[PDB]
Symmetry: C5
Subunit: 202 residues, 5 copies
């Protein structure tokens, strides 16, 4: 098997509209944000503009192949793959993807999609100019799939590992927590990850 | 019947250009806005920038399947479905959809489409800085289908249920009213929902 | 014949690239603007930001069907139809279509496409803050079809749909037809000239 | 041959990717700018915002038809045609096409594509507020085709279509042809240099 | 073979989704930036707005043809070609491509893709108003391909050769360096080119 064959097969038979549930267990989706930059902060309106690297991981066994004498991995356009419908509940602008939209697929079926994203958020910006800093919370969850179809789980490296040293801001701490919430509109629980960003103006 | 089959059938046969009228009764569309955030208000120009959750519900029996030993629901890209052509009569910017464009389809034919939307509106903003607050009205209706083809109806959860606690504004009250209007441009009646948002600066 | 059949036939055969001329007479296209809002006015740069409903009407007999025991009308995506290539000669931004892109087709072949449009124009804004107001002229014509292929012709109240929350008010609207030859092309080109007399509200 | 047949044939034998060279002579492309408006000028940053009408003309003999008892001309979507890859070397924003994207094709093979374009340019703006005015130069050439494949050649009162409501007035427009060798490639690339002499009005 | 045939063949069979590796050696991609303009500089926020030509070059032997009595080269829409997934690590806006999206393909398989791009970057802008100027660094690498699949390499030239004389800024120097980096996220190494742009505001060089 070579890369041409593997990509042909994926394109011909991958089902980007079909959630790859196994045994009607939920698809486990790992999510972790690495912050790259904080661009604009407005303490009056409580809005922040952020660039982040959104690492997303899940299994789709329908993508698997025998890698004995073959590539162990390929890069695939996400339009050819099922991708989880993650949304940030407190976003106030659409996500602007800055990077090429390619996922990495491993022969066992694991998929890694790590786009870089610029997006505005509404959150608590008070204290950004103090020693304690502000604590901004971002909630990311599946938009239409409940906990029995998709479960999200937080995953690492330094919080500033990839954070720009030229930002006006600095990261004090990042914590990631998981939630399961029921909403009035729907019978089922929905999972989300809540990322807490503690940051301040230098 | 598995998801893959259900989604294959819907893609092969749903017809997204055809309004699913039964027995030439109008398609009943339920609409209700849940406000998430009020971002920019300009009392001088009478313009408001709003984020809201537009819950939309209707029946398309052509999507139905026998759910014995089958999923009761699937998520479907809205490009594969008929979707009502709702428009806000007093919008002054195009709707910016913030979330993944997926509708949820139930085996009986019920469709639930609930996008999160950012949009600018022209409305009465006077009094936003008083105790009584301002009352902004948004009219949403089918753009090209008259009352014999589509009827819109509001549906009744608390008003601030999903409203951001970090907005500069707070919601005092939300009411939803139904209208049937004839215009000079056309002979038939057009139904709309009028949502009244009473809000003020905190 | 039901909606599904009518829409299937139109999709299969309608020819969106072909101007529906009959007997080599020009296609008669009716155009009338209904102003909805005036958003930004700059008396210094002579630029105005307008929202308007663009009523456009013409006949395409190739879309006709026998409406005995059939719907008299359907809504059709404009990508399935021939649509006139109208352009505003004094626009300085591309038209932002705010509404669903659907035309209404009658069984006799009449088409009604009426999008809502936000667009910036360069015109005479002087006097906007006086009793007489400013008079802004917008010229709309076929971009590439001359008077033997397409003729445009203007076709109730002025402030009928004009927002009561605008900073501006409409004093008068007149619609005039022109036939112009340019230095570049030997042929003549029809346009409608819409004159908007408006001023700042007290 | 009616218009439907001509357009069917063009669409079916669409090679919009193939430059229509004959006998390995270069395709001769005529270009001339008609300025419509100058919107924003910044003497500090040396940036100008311009609206102009780009008249472009060339032969594609593969589009020809016998026009005996047939239309002499048709309008064709440019996605069905080969179009020259012209770029403005000193542009600092992407071209915003304001008008319908249709070319006019004559039965002999001549093509006429004249879009209206809003674009920002970096050029010499100094002296814009003097009697002599500023002289801004725009260079337009084929981006990837050298002089043996495409030749560009320049070809009416300078302000014939210039808006009388601009803050600026045109003193003079000259068009010059160039043939340049770059460090990147051994071959010469042709361009037209348009010189716009303009000043702030009084 | 004429142009029509060559373009038909490339369209029908070229697999824009398949990296053209030979012998499982990495695809060698050459990258060099030619700066055209620096538009907005903010010393407070450390952001710069740049226009540049991204010259990109690589071999795809699956595009080759026998050029006896045939064109030696064609222009091809990049949607019909494999193109390297380069990204600027310190970009803060998406690249705005200003030019037609066409690559030039030579009969031997060599591809040259040279788009003009406007993009905002986060980098060190301090000293932009001094004689020494600022030194802004831009790192460009393959986003998802590691060093065994894609290697990037910088291409002596004139730095200001295409730089606008009407910019508020002037280029003092440009250097291009190659890196190979391992990240905590992933076991393999990723190559990038680091381009160092030394520039300053005009006016900051007087002797009189
Ligand atoms: C169909 C749909 O949008 O369900 C919404 C679930 N929630 C509340 C997580 C967004
Ligand atoms: C075809 C069409 O746009 O009809 C308009 C109906 N209305 C007034 C609800 C928008
Ligand atoms: C092909 C073409 O654009 O002709 C232009 C006609 N005019 C002057 C009405 C725009
Ligand atoms: C392939 C390519 O972009 O060649 C560039 C020619 N030039 C310098 C006219 C833009
Ligand atoms: C799949 C993927 O995005 O890998 C990331 C490699 N890196 C760190 C160069 C961006």
């Amino acid at each position: 098997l070579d890369r041409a064959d593997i990509l042909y097969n994926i394109r011909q038979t991958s089902r980007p509209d079909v959630i790859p549930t196994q045994r009607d267990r939920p698809v486990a989706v790992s999510v972790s944000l690495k912050f790259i930059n904080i661009l604009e902060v407005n303490e009056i309106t409580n809005e922040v503009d952020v660039v982040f690297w959104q690492q997303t991981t899940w299994s789709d066994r329908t993508l698997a192949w025998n890698s004995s004498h073959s590539p162990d991995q390929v890069s695939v356009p996400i339009s050819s793959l099922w991708v989880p419908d993650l949304a940030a509940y407190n976003a106030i602008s659409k996500p602007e993807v800055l990077t090429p939209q390619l996922a990495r697929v491993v022969s066992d079926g694991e998929v890694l999609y790590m786009p870089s994203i610029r997006q505005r958020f509404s959150c608590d910006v008070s204290g950004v100019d103090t020693e304690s800093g502000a604590t901004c919370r971002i909630k990311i969850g599946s938009w239409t799939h409940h906990s029995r179809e998709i479960s999200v789980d937080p995953t690492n490296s330094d919080d500033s590992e990839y954070f720009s040293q030229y930002s006006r801001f600095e990261i004090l701490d990042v914590t990631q927590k998981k939630n399961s919430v029921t909403y009035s509109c729907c019978p089922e629980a929905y999972e989300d990850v809540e990322v807490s960003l503690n940051f301040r103006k230098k």
